[PDB]
Amino acid sequence: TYKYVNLREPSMDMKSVTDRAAQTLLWTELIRGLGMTLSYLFREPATINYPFEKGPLSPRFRGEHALRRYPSGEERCIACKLCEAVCPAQAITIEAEPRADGSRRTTRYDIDMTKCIYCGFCQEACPVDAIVEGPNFEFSTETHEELLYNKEKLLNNGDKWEAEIAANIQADYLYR
Amino acid sequence: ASATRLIQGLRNWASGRDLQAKLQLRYQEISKRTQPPPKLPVGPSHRLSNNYYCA
Amino acid sequence: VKQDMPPVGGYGPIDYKRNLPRRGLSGYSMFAVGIGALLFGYW
Amino acid sequence: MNLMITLLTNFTLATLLVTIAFWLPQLNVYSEKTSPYECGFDPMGSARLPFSMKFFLVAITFLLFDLEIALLLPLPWASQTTNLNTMLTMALLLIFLLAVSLAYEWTQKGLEWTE
Amino acid sequence: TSVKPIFSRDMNEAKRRVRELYRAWYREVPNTVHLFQLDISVKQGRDKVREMFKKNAHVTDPRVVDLLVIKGKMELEETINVWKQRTHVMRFFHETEAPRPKDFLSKFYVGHDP
Amino acid sequence: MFMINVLTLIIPILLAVAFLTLVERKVLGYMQFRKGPNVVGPYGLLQPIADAIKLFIKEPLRPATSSISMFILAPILALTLALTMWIPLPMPYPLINMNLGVLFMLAMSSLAVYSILWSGWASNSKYALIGALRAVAQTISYEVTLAIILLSVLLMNGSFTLSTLIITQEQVWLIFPAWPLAMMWFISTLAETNRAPFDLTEGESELVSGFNVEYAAGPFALFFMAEYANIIMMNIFTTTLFLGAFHNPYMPELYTINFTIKSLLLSITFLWIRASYPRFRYDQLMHLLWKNFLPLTLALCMWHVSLPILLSSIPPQT
Amino acid sequence: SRGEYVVAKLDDLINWARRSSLWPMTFGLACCAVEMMHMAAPRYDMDRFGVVFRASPRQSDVMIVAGTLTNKMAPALRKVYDQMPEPRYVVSMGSCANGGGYYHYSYSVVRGCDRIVPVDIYVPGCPPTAEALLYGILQLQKKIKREKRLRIWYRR
Amino acid sequence: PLTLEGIKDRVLYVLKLYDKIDPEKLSVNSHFMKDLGLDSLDQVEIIMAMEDEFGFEIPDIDAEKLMCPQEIVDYIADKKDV
Amino acid sequence: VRETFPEATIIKPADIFGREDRFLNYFANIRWFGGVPLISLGKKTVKQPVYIVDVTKGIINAIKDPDARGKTFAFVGPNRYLLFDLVQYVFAVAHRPFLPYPMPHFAYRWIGRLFEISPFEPWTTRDKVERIHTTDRTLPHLPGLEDLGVQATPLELKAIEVLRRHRTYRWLSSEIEDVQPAKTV
Ligand SMILES: CCCCCCCCCCCCCCCCCC(=O)OC[C@H](COP(=O)([O-])OCC[N+](C)(C)C)OC(=O)CCCCCCCCCCCCCCCCC
Ligand SMILES: CCCCCCCCCCCCCCCCCC(=O)OC[C@H](COP(=O)(O)OCCN)OC(=O)CCCCCCCCCCCCCCCCC
Ligand code: SF4
Ligand code: SF4
Ligand code: SF4
């Protein structure tokens, strides 16, 4: 159930002593290493041509946040604050009130994308699939406060990426 | 996999191993990106009888 | 039920041992090639 | 004459690639960029302290084997002489004396480093 | 009321250790101004050492002042060895902080803190 | 018209350095299963121009603690000695035909150490001084065999003349009679030029950058191009020593193309040894060139003295 | 005019030379150093973009703060940044280097390296993918491309 | 080390280079704490100025017993010949 | 500015010094030109420089003062120097050799047109020549730093902080207790 790495005594007949001395004087293993490096020289390299080719992803992928809507236009967030209660970085800040037609909807729904740890607890705690963590990951900013998303930026990410988020959730939701 | 047989043979000679049997570049043999919908099995306590929580 | 499961007969064999296949000439042949190159150069 | 022109040309466009390297860009010098580099933090004392040489006996012996290649160097010329047994004997005696010196520095553990 | 000491059996050995620590800091300050190449005088650093020692001049418990001597010698070990930098030495000079309002009227004017 | 000859020597061997940076990065890339630079030009052919223009428009940064006269004088001497070791090299006819050109190459190998040396000392930093004295610990190891190997390879030539070293190898390559001297000379030129596995001065993982850890861009380019000029010059010198080609006196271009492709194969071999090995501890360097290469080099020196006497094959000095 | 064309083509030349020869320094801090190494890995391969490691700050262009900046290494980050020649750039990688991150309310975390160094590009993620870090580097190259140094100098 | 008078005058020179003590009240028999109005650390840096000037290390238990410059010059007389 | 904004707070600094100034760094970066030329050895003009943190504290305490509306302030230092002993003190903090020589009207207005011949930043200009050799006026009627509650910091506390950048290496690690201060007037 155990093995001894490096416990081989070298043979001491004239054949193997001459082989080790030719290895010392004629550098067998150094030519072996050069042969392996030359063997990787003649290969097709694994470099994809980004930004024209994209690395492979799964429909489970956790990128930029987005608030979804029902297939009626009504947004799914009903202000229940499970996503900010489960959020391990406390990046989510929610404040709500009953709106003009008496519905439990949010007024403030902020996700600080510089606190957020992209772990997808908010999308798996959300009981109505409102907040999801979408497939975009190329959303770098030149300014720090552009990564402080309010409700309007999250709703625009939802209305931007819904045609892809709906298909990822459609391919994935049976595992949840 | 498109390496010509002279370069393929030189590359096998330089490594000393058979390299086309074990390629570190992936091709058609890997799984499909679009998988059929699954059916996950339920646990042992998904029962309607003899399933009290206290036991 | 449909689930990520291995196939019926199991997966194939997966090698895991050291495979350094001992290529190259012996010592005496390499010394003979080298000394022959020396003698041709000297002549 | 041509050698001095070549050396002057090489020195000239060595120092013409330095004066277009200092006088071309835009400089913003302040007294933290010109500080000594010691991997983010300050150097604990100056670099002008004695940085002790452990390979010192080999460093002396470089000077006594560097004279050997001032002695052994006319051997492509000294083979052209008409006193060849004596030349061969003195040549192999000088390489043998170098080898006896190296063997004595071997056995007295002088090529090994201190500490 | 029978507790276990640290180094000092009473207040006299404790004041002896405080006095040796003050001697050590007073010797250290000119080298601290020199090798860190600070922008203060040596007398200003000695004034800051005096203020940091007079900050704790009210304690009559031997274990507490033993721990203060231990923490001060840890500060001194981080000063003699260049482990602190110019920033960690100049954190004792609260320079970038504005002077807080001390009287009641300006604290009333600017905020709610008593 | 000789000034035109000097300029047509020293400008293409700066452009060869420039495109050697691209060759180095792409061959090092494909040997490491990645790609090299291929975005900046057509398959990378314009990457060295950007790498060259970027360094001469970046801030020069003379340090505070530096001895500024030596700090600026060291890369000047680096690039000067990078250029002036090409002038006795027969291509098939050298720029400056020297009777004693081999010792000129050896003396300017010795003088080039003061570039790294005064640069590491003058930039008053600690990693710079460590790299500057590991340059001493490497130079006292390679120079004490670099002379005897090069001495023994000229005992079959007849003189210290580089131009006669083409006539010498008209029948056979000189790597056939002296392949131990060749495979030891190649390692001594690896250790000479601070190329891996003998980096040890610009040691990226022991030191930060070693002797030029303070040299910002502009003065830093004249060590980078000096090192690459030394490797191209040194593979050309190794090609002239051991792999000399056919010289048609009426057609010099045959010899020029032939030793060009041979020196390119030796430079690719430098890049291919750099892409495969770990790096020495620099005592194991000193316990190599003194304890392994120097006794065998003295033995081969005795052999190549006594062997032209033995076979009546003493070469002419004329 | 003529001189506007001259300084415009010289700006395009120097912006090309500076965006296609970015030399980042070897500077990781935390988990994001692993994904920065994967941005150097043979799949994504920074080196094809002219993006190659230089270990010293004197010989480097952009400082990728990749990881968590604590209170103990804030002056080390600042002195590394100061010992970079100008032009020097900063790419912020990961949430802790952006805004404090998962350790935001900690006693010993500098809440973003924008408190310490001026930051050009913010790359978001915990960690961002190596594809997203390469996106941030290409956006830094786009930011260098539209610089107007000599055009403003000829117009000032 | 030569004379007692030079040592006493050198103690006075040390304490007139010192900035907190009133030079008017500064006498050989003046007490540091209750007359010159000094903190204990002020007396400690007086002792360290004596160490800087005279050139011999003064321990703790025999420097706390130095509450006037007459005790200082007597202690310097005890550790030397004069 | 006064006649189009009646409540304008106009502030008069005399000579501002700091890490990135062009007052002490102007004096310290003329060493390899030949020996710091002056008019009448620079001893007929009197200056009082002001420190930039005091200027900034004065500007911001004028922001927070409603009683600074319409006022005109004159931010000056606590001590008045000549120009010659000022340049003495600048080269003495920088630990540099000091070999002055007088330079009259005959060509020191022509070193202006000698030293803006390139379209870069001119190292010195004739306006800078006329302003270095212009004395600072004393206006007792205008309020200053102390009338805004800002303590004017002298040059003997911050000249080391400005001028440590110009010491070569052989006197970098020195002290602030090395230089005897410049004489006031
Ligand atoms: C110029 C064109 C190319 C030339 C050929 C070279 C191409 C291949 C290059 C490979 C990459 C090498 C990179 C650097 C490697 C550095 C490490 C290394 O190899 O160190 C050297 C190593 C060192 O070995 P080591 O490191 O194991 O040292 C052993 C040390 N002890 C025992 C203490 C542990 O080998 C040598 O020193 C060999 C030197 C050359 C030997 C030549 C022998 C010729 C034959 C002589 C006669 C023999 C028979 C007897 C007489 C018979 C008479 C009839
Ligand atoms: C000894 C041999 C030494 C050889 C050294 C050089 C080796 C490499 C040679 C070059 C290889 C090809 C390089 C091609 C680069 C890309 C050219 C190009 O198309 O640039 C496009 C760019 C912008 O064009 P624009 O009009 O804005 O496009 C918008 C279109 N809607 O337009 C521009 O940027 C403007 C045009 C610039 C063209 C530059 C081309 C390269 C010049 C390199 C210098 C050397 C020239 C030859 C010297 C040796 C022979 C004398
Ligand atoms: S992914 Fe995690 S850290 Fe980010 S908002 Fe959701 S719960 Fe919070
Ligand atoms: S996003 Fe979901 S979990 Fe969060 S408050 Fe809205 S409905 Fe609840
Ligand atoms: S932002 Fe997060 S994942 Fe990234 S380095 Fe920081 S702690 Fe690690």
- Say how many CA atoms lie within 13 Å of E34 toward its Cβ: 12
Count CB atoms within 10 A of the CB of residue A30: 14
Residue F210 vs residues D13, D41, F36, F200, F276: alpha-carbon distances, Å: 26, 17, 25, 8, 22
Count CB atoms within 10 A of the CB of residue F108: 17
CB G73 within 8 A of CB D40: yes
The encoded tokens of residue F217 equal 């861009």
Residue I22, SS3 per DSSP: coil
At I13, give phi and psi (nearest 5°).
-80, 145
At D90, give phi and psi (nearest 5°).
-70, -30
Q: What is the dihedral of CA F269, F275, F281, F287, to 10 degrees?
A: -20
- The 8-class DSSP code of residue I21 comes to -
CB crowding F20-57: b at 16 or more within 10 Å, else e? bbbbbbbbbbbbbbbbbbbbbeeebebbbbbbbbbbbb
Whole-angstrom distance, CA of residue F59 vs CA of residue D22: 8
**Which active-site residues of H does the annotation give?**
39
Measured at the CA of F222, the angle between CA F216 and CA F224, to 5 degrees, comes to 85
Query: What is the distance in angstroms between the CA of the first residue and the CA of the last residue of chain E?
Result: 37
Count CB atoms within 10 A of the CB of residue F183: 15
Residue numbers in E near I172 (CB within 8 A):
37
- Contact partners, residue E96, CB within 8 Å, separation at least 6: none
Beta pairing partners, F142? none
Nearest protein Cα to ligand 5, atom 8: G31
The shortest CB-CB distance from I177 to any of E37, E39, E41 is to E41
Count CB atoms within 10 A of the CB of residue G35: 24
Whole-angstrom distance, CA of residue A112 vs CA of residue F21: 44
- The 8-class DSSP code of residue G123 comes to E
At A106, give phi and psi (nearest 5°).
-85, 155
Q: What is the dihedral of CA I57, I59, I61, I65, to 10 degrees?
A: 170
Whole-angstrom distance, CA of residue C41 vs CA of residue I136: 90
Whole-angstrom distance, CA of residue F105 vs CA of residue F237: 9
- The 8-class DSSP code of residue G25 comes to B
Whole-angstrom distance, CA of residue F269 vs CA of residue A22: 22
- The 8-class DSSP code of residue B41 comes to P
Do the chains contact at C34 and F177, CB–CB below 8 Å?
no
Whole-angstrom distance, CA of residue I163 vs CA of residue A93: 50
Whole-angstrom distance, CA of residue F219 vs CA of residue F207: 20
| Domain count across chain D | 1
Whole-angstrom distance, CA of residue G154 vs CA of residue G131: 38
Whole-angstrom distance, CA of residue D43 vs CA of residue A154: 49
> 3-state secondary structure string, chain F?
CHHHHHHHHHCHHHHHHHHHHHHHHHHHHHCCCCCCCCCCCHHHCCHHHHHHHHHCCCCCCCCCCCCHHHHHHHHHHHHHHHHCCCCCCCCCCCCCCCCCHHHHHHHHHHHCHHHHHHHHHHCCCHHHHHHHHHHHHHHHHHHHHHHHHHHHCCCCCCCCCCCHHHHCCCCCCCCCCCHHHHHHHHHHHHHHCCCCCCCCCCCCCCCCCHHHCCCCCCCCHHHHHHHHHHHHHHHHHHHHHHCCCCCCCCCHHHHHHHHHHHHHHHHHHHHHHHCCCCCCCHHHHHHHHCCCHHHHHHHHHHHHHHHHHHHCCCCCCC
Whole-angstrom distance, CA of residue F212 vs CA of residue F75: 10
Residue I124, SS3 per DSSP: coil
Q: Residue F302: which of F185, F181, F188, F191 has the closest Cα?
A: F181
Measured at the CA of D15, the angle between CA F54 and CA G9, to 5 degrees, comes to 30
Q: Residue A137: which of G39, G133, G63 has the closest Cα?
A: G133
Locate tokens 């930011």: which residue? G143
At G109, give phi and psi (nearest 5°).
-135, 120
| Domain count across chain H | 1
Q: Residue I95: which of I37, I16, I175, I39 has the closest Cα?
A: I175
Q: Is the peptide bond before I104 cis (omega within 30 degrees of 0)?
A: no
Residue numbers in G near E88 (CB within 8 A):
75
- Contact partners, residue B13, CB within 8 Å, separation at least 6: A35
Radius of gyration (C-alpha) of chain I in whole angstroms: 18
Nearest protein Cα to ligand 4, atom 7: A77
Residue H64 vs residues E15, G43, H46: alpha-carbon distances, Å: 11, 74, 11
CA dihedral (G85, G89, G91, G96) positive or negative: positive
The encoded tokens of residue H62 equal 């025999």
Resolution in angstroms for this experimental structure?
3.4
- Say how many CA atoms lie within 13 Å of F157 toward its Cβ: 26
Residue A96, SS3 per DSSP: strand
Ligand 2 contact, F278 CB (< 6 A): no
The encoded tokens of residue F153 equal 């390879």
CB F285 within 8 A of CB F198: yes
Do the chains contact at G126 and A146, CB–CB below 8 Å?
no
The encoded tokens of residue F125 equal 């930093």
At G135, give phi and psi (nearest 5°).
-65, -45
Q: Residue A55: which of G123, G38, G131 has the closest Cα?
A: G131
- Contact partners, residue F66, CB within 8 Å, separation at least 6: F122, F123, F124, F214, I169
Which atom number of ligand 1 is nearest to the Cα of residue F186?
A: 1
Locate tokens 């704490």: which residue? H33
CB G99 within 8 A of CB A15: no
Mutation probe of ligand 5 site: the residue of G27, G32, G64, G103 with most atoms within 8 A of C-beta: G32
Residue A28, SS3 per DSSP: helix
CA dihedral (E59, E61, E62, E66) positive or negative: negative
- Give residue H50's domain range: 1-82
Residue G151, SS3 per DSSP: helix
Amino acid D106 reads W
Residue H41, SS3 per DSSP: helix
Q: Is the peptide bond before G127 cis (omega within 30 degrees of 0)?
A: yes
Whole-angstrom distance, CA of residue E73 vs CA of residue E25: 9
Residue F13 vs residues D16, F16, F110: alpha-carbon distances, Å: 17, 5, 21
Whole-angstrom distance, CA of residue F234 vs CA of residue F85: 9
CA dihedral (H54, H55, H61, H62) positive or negative: negative
Whole-angstrom distance, CA of residue A75 vs CA of residue G151: 48
Which atom number of ligand 3 is nearest to the Cα of residue A125?
A: 7
